[PDB]
Amino acid sequence: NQVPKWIQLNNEIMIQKDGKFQFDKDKEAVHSYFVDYINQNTVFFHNLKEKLDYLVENQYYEEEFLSLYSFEDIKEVFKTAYAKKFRFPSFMSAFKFYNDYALKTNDKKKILERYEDRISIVALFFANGDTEKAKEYVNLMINQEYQPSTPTFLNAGRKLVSCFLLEVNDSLNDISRAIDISMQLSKLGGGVSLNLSKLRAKGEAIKDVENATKGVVGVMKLLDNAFRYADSGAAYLNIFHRDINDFLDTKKISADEDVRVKTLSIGVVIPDKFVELAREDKAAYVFYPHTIYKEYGQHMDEMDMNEMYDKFVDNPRVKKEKINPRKLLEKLAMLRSESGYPYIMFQDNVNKVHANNHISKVKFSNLCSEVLQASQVSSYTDYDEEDEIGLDISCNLGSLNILNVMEHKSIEKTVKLATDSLTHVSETTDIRNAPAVRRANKAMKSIGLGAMNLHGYLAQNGIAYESPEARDFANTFFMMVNFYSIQRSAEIAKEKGETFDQYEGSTYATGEYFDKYVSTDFSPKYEKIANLFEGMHIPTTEDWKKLKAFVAEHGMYHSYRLCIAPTGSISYVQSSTASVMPIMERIEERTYGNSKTYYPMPGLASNNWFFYKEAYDMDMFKVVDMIATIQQHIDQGISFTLFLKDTMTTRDLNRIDLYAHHRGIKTIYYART
Amino acid sequence: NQVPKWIQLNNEIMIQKDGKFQFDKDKEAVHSYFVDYINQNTVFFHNLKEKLDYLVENQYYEEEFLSLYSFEDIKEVFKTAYAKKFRFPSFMSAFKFYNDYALKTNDKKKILERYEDRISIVALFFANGDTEKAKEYVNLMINQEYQPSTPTFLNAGRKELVSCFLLEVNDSLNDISRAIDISMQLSKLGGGVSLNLSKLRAKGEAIKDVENATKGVVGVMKLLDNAFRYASGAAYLNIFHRDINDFLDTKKISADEDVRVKTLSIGVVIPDKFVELAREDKAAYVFYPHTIYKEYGQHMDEMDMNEMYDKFVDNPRVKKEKINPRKLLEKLAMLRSESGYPYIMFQDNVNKVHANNHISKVKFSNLCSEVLQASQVSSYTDYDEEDEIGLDISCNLGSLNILNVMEHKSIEKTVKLATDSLTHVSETTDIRNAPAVRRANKAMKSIGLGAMNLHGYLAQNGIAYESPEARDFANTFFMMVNFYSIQRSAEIAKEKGETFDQYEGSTYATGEYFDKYVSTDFSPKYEKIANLFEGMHIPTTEDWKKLKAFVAEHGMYHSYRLCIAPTGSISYVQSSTASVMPIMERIEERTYGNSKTYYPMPGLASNNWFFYKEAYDMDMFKVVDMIATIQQHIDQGISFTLFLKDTMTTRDLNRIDLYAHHRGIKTIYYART
Ligand SMILES: Nc1ncnc2c1ncn2[C@H]1C[C@H](O)[C@@H](COP(=O)(O)OP(=O)(O)OP(=O)(O)O)O1
Ligand SMILES: Nc1ncnc2c1ncn2[C@H]1C[C@H](O)[C@@H](COP(=O)(O)OP(=O)(O)OP(=O)(O)O)O1
Ligand SMILES: Nc1ncnc2c1ncn2[C@H]1C[C@H](O)[C@@H](COP(=O)(O)OP(=O)(O)OP(=O)(O)O)O1
Ligand SMILES: Nc1ncnc2c1ncn2[C@H]1C[C@H](O)[C@@H](COP(=O)(O)OP(=O)(O)OP(=O)(O)O)O1
């Protein structure tokens, strides 16, 4: 019943020694943890050869790519991995990896893969042919300079993408196909979110008889029962719809028995016209979209609300409904004060900066509220009848540490390797049950790259989070990031000579995206910021012009490059902070079982106590301006999370909302208190 | 606010005039009803021609088959229909037809089709070419000698047609998707759809990689219960299964929130081995059927329990579970004492008399608990992968009056016409979303014929319901019915020369079904019974031998012929009793709205008060013996309904259950109290 030694040592840090914390004990706890639990459950082997032979003959490793080299080259790779003599810096830095991510045995009671093992297996998977490139991947990963995404880091060479985005056309057959594909992807563990734009609303005619449709709530009920069957997503909705009130009455603290969704989140799509009507204090008109489909032939949100709203008001054919926008934003503020639900996307900020609006305009987002790409709906006909295949969105992920990049200045080569890595991942991927995801993943070739560790590095260097210097720093940094990113994409496009489809329809072929960079140079405006990037080259606008010419030579290989995800579950292995959202508390406290695990933030010393500010004690406006400065280079959304208090006000909340709409923040997240 | 005249006249019957009822007022109420509500809402026309032209040009009648004759022949058919000068005998005899079944207008406020109209349209639909045959259908129907089934009587020549669907669910994710798809497809067609969950793996079991991963049968029931709420059937289960207790905990008066099915009924399949184990007071062993599928390759209920039960006990591979059968029948008696749920099928009584056991054995039944045919499961593979098509069951229905048959002695010609009618109906049927139903309905060609009006005719003639004379009467009657039925099937088989597939595999080609009729002649054993059939020919066993030879010449066209359904909703139009179940109460009382509609049973006079017995005051054993005498000629099940009282006993209930198992009653129904 006694608590073991390392947990007891980890509980020692809260003892006040001269008003401080016992940080130096922490390593000792880690030095306990590698003696009394880890090195007494590892399966023992003589050397490498039999080890790998035992790993093959019990159905663990996919033996194909592990047969495509010599034994000696793999031995050199493992030798390069063990030559680091790597150590962990913190207590959770081991515990989150040797409990869940690292490979266990069949009885789930022993440990096979060491920390070099998993990384070097990932390295040979990203190699696909070159030994020295695999060594480059090792030197990239073992210095914690790059982190692949969660399911890629898990399921490399065992028995892959955690983000799926679909559309539901309007038929019975379409709803059947949708529930089919959701149950298919549900066992694959990824993130699956739907959208209910083109559906007819409640109390409407079904092809023969008026007032026959049970509406959106029944489809939500079927999906809520549907995800309860397998190993949880969400759904979005554009606001110009009658049942939007019933779409928002689901998340309710006085929850109805039938109106009860504990699985799917919800979210609202809002263009500028509704914002205008809520500002100027006038009426609003939600519609019956099936009447619009009968009238104009197209669907509702496939046209501009700013161009067509009063024209639909003027049409006697479209049956309408008048409501109050201001009371509706008040109700949104109340429901976000309850939890923070739903999600919010401002599409006009997105499409006016989007490159690929010539295919379609972005209407929705994933569960992770980040990926904003084109989407064409399919049409699933009857059994012997053939179908028509639209386009879908499937985004594999991956971020990186800012800190080690700043330590080593190999940011270019880092992007060079990570781009090829995610390229080979999207090469490898295949799904054999949803054909539109198949066609789009072959077609669009969308990769997603981001970064964590913003708060901690700049807080450890002694720069406040609300400083303008950090905003200029992030501006110059992400400018150079996007620069080398497009540079590598153009290089690979020259290597293959095969861009994505309808490349001339993009703004990339015209250089309209490049028109921001031909002027308005992003040189550092502070000396202390300039000392940080001091020691390496920073490009000029003429370098952007040479880049524009080199793009105009061939083109770009990818259609999308960047994403920012709240990668907290693999934040702990990199032993760092979250992404760009600053930290909540200086000390995290968990109870694994009969235990009080005490996690300090990395870099917690006496001097930098003030730069480790608290999330409840910050200017939200400067945070939004930081995220807007970050937004200057990112194609997709940014995982912006609101940090609130009970003492705050929905007046101030909606002021922050309209402030972010005025700045141009794409999406937000669930709010915390 | 005043009650109209005819309802006030209909409420007059409960006034005691010399201790009697005001029967003679009732016709007066009917004579009121054709003056003050019906003949003041009929759309008025000059004559036939413009009438039909107006009916075409507003999308009511399917104009194809109504273009395949002359105008004059249709005029002769309508003239023959109006030449009857038909009247209704009772008050509900109009009210159940001019309120729901007869055709209304688009605003649902006026009446177009008269009572001749609907019948003669059905007549021309059954004609398909011959005017005189249509006149024969008129002379059949307008004397109330035959009644087609409910959706055929509704949707003839309008804007599917068979109210009975039976499916199977193979074991995959894809199969469950296909099952929910087909259920939602048939749900808008309004028919009866019931499933079966035999071949599914049970709760807490391995899903292909990881032990204890299956949520079990309850989640699939939850999905189906949500599924039918969107657009109502049932499902069956064989008892040798671990989750059978959880399969019976759904219908519970102390209902759980999650375990709550207000839509689907449930039912139990029981062979003789479990009956034996419950009698002899020993243990029982339910199984994990996926282990059996891994062991023997086949599925569980595709083999004999009597041959394999102890062999599965002897296998160490099959994981088992020991339970008490006697306490389980006690729990069944308790749950039937709660409501009467679930349903019960004794398959060994069925298969030992079934002709077509060479294809498969019957495992389940429909919602109406009557149709017991073969069923091969399909296998629904992935998207580009092709599937394999099994066999399904789809049974259109139809019964007849016994009374007018006894009045006119045209029983042979009646069967001659009704067989061709249901034949043409099964010709006409097509569904374009469930391919196995398509293939089976083309293949098996199963028709279903029955009869109502057993209790009332023999009660009006002055013969008690519990008499042996009625049992001999029904024996001789249904013997001759089945005789002429097989005679007409052989005639049509000679007409086409194309029997159903695998006809030589049947017992009909071998005459093993005919071996009962070569001896043991069913001559009437009472003089009073013999006077009823007196005046017409009754066949002999040598006539059965000639029938056997004529069958051996060609064969039989159909694989199934007979069914008995509780056709109460179209009992009222024929102005008669139900089918073979005797009546509950002598007077039915309903409240349409602010009203007390008082329905007397037909033939209610002072003399026959005693022969109109009450259902709570009868010998159940003689009822079961009556149904067993009826069972001597019917291939399918019989809609046997239990009539119980609160003063009765589950001891006596289970005694009746085992009594019916000893007699050989196929299925039972929900019990009433
Ligand atoms: N933080 C850590 N990360 C990884 N391994 C660790 C960590 N802490 C201890 N160990 C491992 C390494 C060794 O196998 C064992 C402890 O030996 P350790 O003292 O840490 O290495 P070392 O040999 O380089 O130092 P020393 O020479 O002082 O013994 O457990
Ligand atoms: N029985 C039903 N109950 C509820 N909703 C239904 C039902 N049947 C169909 N629907 C709903 C969901 C469908 O998306 C929508 C239309 O159904 P569906 O028949 O598949 O469209 P359709 O392609 O045949 O033609 P249309 O565009 O005129 O509706 O109404
Ligand atoms: N039970 C009924 N069934 C059908 N129609 C009826 C019924 N009762 C009354 N009517 C109809 C028939 C007529 O159109 C009208 C009533 O006339 P009705 O007296 O019944 O016929 P009738 O003309 O043969 O008798 P009578 O010569 O004595 O008037 O309503
Ligand atoms: N994620 C899941 N959650 C619950 N049940 C599942 C899940 N995935 C599959 N199943 C259930 C329902 C399926 O009928 C059953 C097996 O699934 P499935 O993969 O379709 O079978 P299979 O044809 O691929 O091979 P096998 O016969 O070995 O199961 O287990």
Residue numbers in the entry:
A (entry chain C): 4 to 162, 167 to 238, 246 to 687
B (entry chain D): 4 to 162, 166 to 237, 246 to 687
Give sentences from the paper:
Because enzyme activity requires both α and β subunits, cryo-EM was repeated with mixtures of holo-NrdE and NrdF (abbreviated as “NrdEF”) under inhibiting conditions. The resultant cryo-EM map revealed a NrdEF filament consisting of a single-helical NrdE strand (gray surface) with EM density corresponding to NrdF observed at higher contour levels filling the helical interior (green). The resolution of the reconstruction varied across the map, as high-resolution features were distinguishable in NrdE but not in NrdF. Additional density was observed in a hydrophobic cleft of NrdE (green) that was previously shown to bind the β C-terminus in other class I RNRs. Density for the NrdF core is significantly weaker than the remainder of the NrdEF map, but density for the NrdF C-terminus is observed at similar thresholds as NrdE. This discrepancy suggests that the NrdF core is flexibly linked to NrdE by NrdF C-termini, resulting in high occupancy but significant variability in orientation. Attempts to refine the map from biased initial models with little gap between NrdE and NrdF invariably converged to have a pronounced gap of roughly 15–20  Å between the subunits (see the section “Methods”). Thus, instead of forming a buried interface with NrdE, the NrdF core density is on average placed far from the catalytic sites. For both filaments, excess density at the S-site was modeled as dATP.
Ribonucleotide reductases (RNRs) catalyze the conversion of ribonucleotides to deoxyribonucleotides, a conserved reaction that is fundamental to DNA-based life. Nearly all aerobic organisms use class I RNRs, which consist of two subunits: α, which contains the catalytic site, and β, which houses a subclass-dependent metal center. Contrary to all other class Ib RNRs studied to-date, the sole RNR of Bacillus subtilis displays class Ia-like activity regulation. We find that B. subtilis RNR has arrived at a remarkably similar solution to the ATP-cone through the evolution of two unique allosteric sites that modulate catalytic activity by inducing contrasting quaternary interactions that either enable or prevent the full range of motions needed for RNR activity.
